Amino acid sequence: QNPQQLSANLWAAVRARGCQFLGPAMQEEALKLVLLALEDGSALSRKVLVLFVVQRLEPRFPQASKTSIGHVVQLLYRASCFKVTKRDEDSSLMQLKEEFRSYEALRREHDAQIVHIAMEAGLRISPEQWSSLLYGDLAHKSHMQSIIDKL
RNA sequence: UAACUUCUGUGAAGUUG
Numbered sequence: 001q002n003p004q005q006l007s008a009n010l011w012a013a014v015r016a017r018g019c020q021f022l023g024p025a026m027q028e029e030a031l032k033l034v035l036l037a038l039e040d041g042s043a044l045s046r047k048v049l050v051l052f053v054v055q056r057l058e059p060r061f062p063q064a065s066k067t068s069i070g071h072v073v074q075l076l077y078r079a080s081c082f083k084v085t086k087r088d089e090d091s092s093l094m095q096l097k098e099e100f101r102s103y104e105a106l107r108r109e110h111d112a113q114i115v116h117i118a119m120e121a122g123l124r125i126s127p128e129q130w131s132s133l134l135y136g137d138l139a140h141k142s143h144m145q146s147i148i149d150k151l
Numbered sequence: 152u153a154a155c156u157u158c159u160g161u162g163a164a165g166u167u168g
Contacts, residue, residue: 007152008152015153018161020152046158065154067154068155091158091159
């Protein structure tokens with residue numbers, strides 16, 4: 001496959017899982033807001049986490065909605081980033097696992113989950129293309145290479 | 152990379168196009 005087919009097939013696979021990558025700038029800001037809410041160990045319902053993030057992104061990002069931010073939260077959920085507390089007959093509460101309570105750690109797990117989805121879908125994407133896809137530059141090749149090699 | 156809505160989702164369904 002050419003780069004364009006790889007990209008389209010990747011986002012199809014991500015979306016098929018109820019997840020979304022919103023673009024490099026917006027995704028970064030969304031993840032920073034998840035941290036802002038959860039880095040201190042607060043236990044939020046999925047609904048309240050999404051509200052926290054959406055409200056802060058809406059001024060800058062017309063893409064921001066409960067739907068689009070929900071997709072980002074789902075990506076982190078699928079990546080096992082949350083300690084989930086079940087409550088009988090009620091909404092579960094979510095905390096960030098202690099190991100993911102910094103941007104570097106959370107972002108790495110996020111990126112690894114998208115690479116994992118690519119692998120699930122049979123897509124072989126170079127570190128160069130990964131850097132472009134997830135960061136909009138070619139400066140994150142070594143980072144993506146590390147993720148690929150640890151997967 | 153269809154948008155949105157509901158939902159306790161390693162995910163579902165619905166509305167619109």
